[PDB]
């Protein structure tokens, strides 16, 4: 059972004010729902489709197309570590090994207490300060395997 909140709905309509087609607010509507609830549940697709006036199949295809729109439940914090070519040169694998040792999970999985969700991600545009990790809203550069568990304790 899903119901869009009043603030979510008003933000969605304000987003469709910005475009000449209401379909163009689908990505930002999914991002609004994701920001409010951590992820996009199954009924959120039909709710966004009903508000936007587009079929739910297109909303589901958009939500499954984009990697930053999560259609599966995640933890309270999402760690996104860069695994692209420059951070591979700078050694992201030590960072990934430290993350898997500290969190005791594989990439794409969630910690048993729902605190952290480990995810690989593409280049974060911070290659000169690599390797880079992107926790929920904060990007951390110049990573070392020793600083990983110190960095992870500041996200309760």
């Amino acid at each position: 059972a899903f119901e869009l909140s009043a603030a979510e709905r008003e933000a969605i309509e304000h987003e469709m004010h910005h475009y000449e087609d209401p379909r163009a607010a689908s990505i930002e509507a999914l991002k609004i729902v994701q920001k409010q609830r951590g992820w996009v549940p199954d009924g959120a697709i039909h709710a966004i489709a009903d508000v936007l006036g587009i079929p739910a199949s297109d909303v589901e295809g958009v939500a499954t197309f984009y990697s930053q729109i999560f259609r599966q439940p995640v933890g309270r914090h999402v760690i996104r570590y860069c695994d692209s070519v420059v951070c591979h040169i700078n050694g992201y694998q030590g960072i990934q090994a430290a993350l898997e040792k500290k969190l005791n999970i594989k990439p794409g999985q969630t910690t048993f207490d729902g605190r952290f969700t480990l995810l690989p991600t593409c280049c974060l545009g911070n290659c000169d300060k690599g390797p880079n990790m992107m926790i929920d809203e904060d990007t951390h550069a110049h990573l070392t395997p020793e600083a990983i568990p110190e960095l992870l304790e500041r996200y309760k």
Binding site: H18, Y19, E20, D21, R23, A24, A25, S26, I27, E28, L30, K31, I54, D58, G61, V62, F65, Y66, S67, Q68, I69, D83, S84, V85, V86, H88, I89, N90, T121, C122, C123, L124, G125, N126, C127, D128, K129, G130, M134, E137, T139
Partner: protein, 439 residues
Amino acid sequence: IIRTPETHPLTWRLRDDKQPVWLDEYRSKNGYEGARKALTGLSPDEIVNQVKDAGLKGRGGAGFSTGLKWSLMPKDESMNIRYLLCNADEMEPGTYKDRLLMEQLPHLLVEGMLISAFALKAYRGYIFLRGEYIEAAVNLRRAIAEATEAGLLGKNIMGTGFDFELFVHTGAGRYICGEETALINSLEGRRANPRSKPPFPATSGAWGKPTCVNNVETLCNVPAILANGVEWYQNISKSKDAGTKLMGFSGRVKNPGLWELPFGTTAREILEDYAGGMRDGLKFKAWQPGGAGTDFLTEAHLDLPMEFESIGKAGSRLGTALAMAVDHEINMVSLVRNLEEFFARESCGWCTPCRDGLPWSVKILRALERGEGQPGDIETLEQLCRFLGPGKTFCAHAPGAVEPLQSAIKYFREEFEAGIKQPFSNTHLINGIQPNLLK
């Protein structure tokens, strides 16, 4: 290093504490003078011709001239609805120039889109931004609010009757969205499948309307041209490519960074005189000139000017001009496997060769990494290179995917030979059936 405004049109107004420049400080340091001149004393066709004969080329990575792209907009007065899009995606690995461009100089981008929208008669403008540039989004939104409060945006800009509305469309994290037709499809709320050209977006782009898509750096180069003139821009460097470019070296160098250099600057000065050379205990092995989608080059190609024609004649591309250096400690098979894993997982799934041949190259490179390679794997990689070139796939994602693979096979084949250990085996034995022993 001093940065005079005459030779550093983009980065001379950066602050030493890496803090953003807001409206008062930007306007104090010769801000919106080019926008004022273009919107008051210049016709849109005059601005288009000024950008055209200034020689401003596309800074996205293809080098198409911006004035000719603006000139192919339709001449019909009935098509009043027009769109200007800023490709602030910058999802290429090895590219970090747009992040520095709008994280601390947002008003330069705002002024550039204002000038380009007045030149293109674009009634609306969108900054298609990646979702990972949060600080850039905050700075751009604050700069848009400051320019709207100051009369630089909205209705009746400078009293000239020109109306322009600028928005920031924060993306949802997909690499293919940087492709301009895929950018238009993603802006319309659809899946970011690219479109076949012709028709080009200038004729029918966003929502069927005339649309022009330009990179952040091209729109940042625009106001310097409009404020200082064409003759200053053509006299920056004595090269074919006019103006400056954000170049820099990344990866285990002494100073991995970002500098603004004129075209024709050789890659050895960027590596040694600016990045300080390789780190201690590491020797230079290879480099990519323009990001993850470019061909690898060797030490012999380091004495080459960073122009489109010079790097193009060496079997590579200038690209985003942000070179990435590979030392001797990095295995080429692992590096190419990382590159192809990125390119295979960032496919949009539309067309067959990229979607179904990049995972094959990924699996072959994984087999070569652990020494489980079988004969014919490198021939398969070469055929995947040949059959994923330009014109074979629906867009240019897969040619850029296969450029590093073919350059590494060409220059470092002995590292790829080392992975082939097992004999070729595709079938298992079936009892009661004698196999066809092909000699």
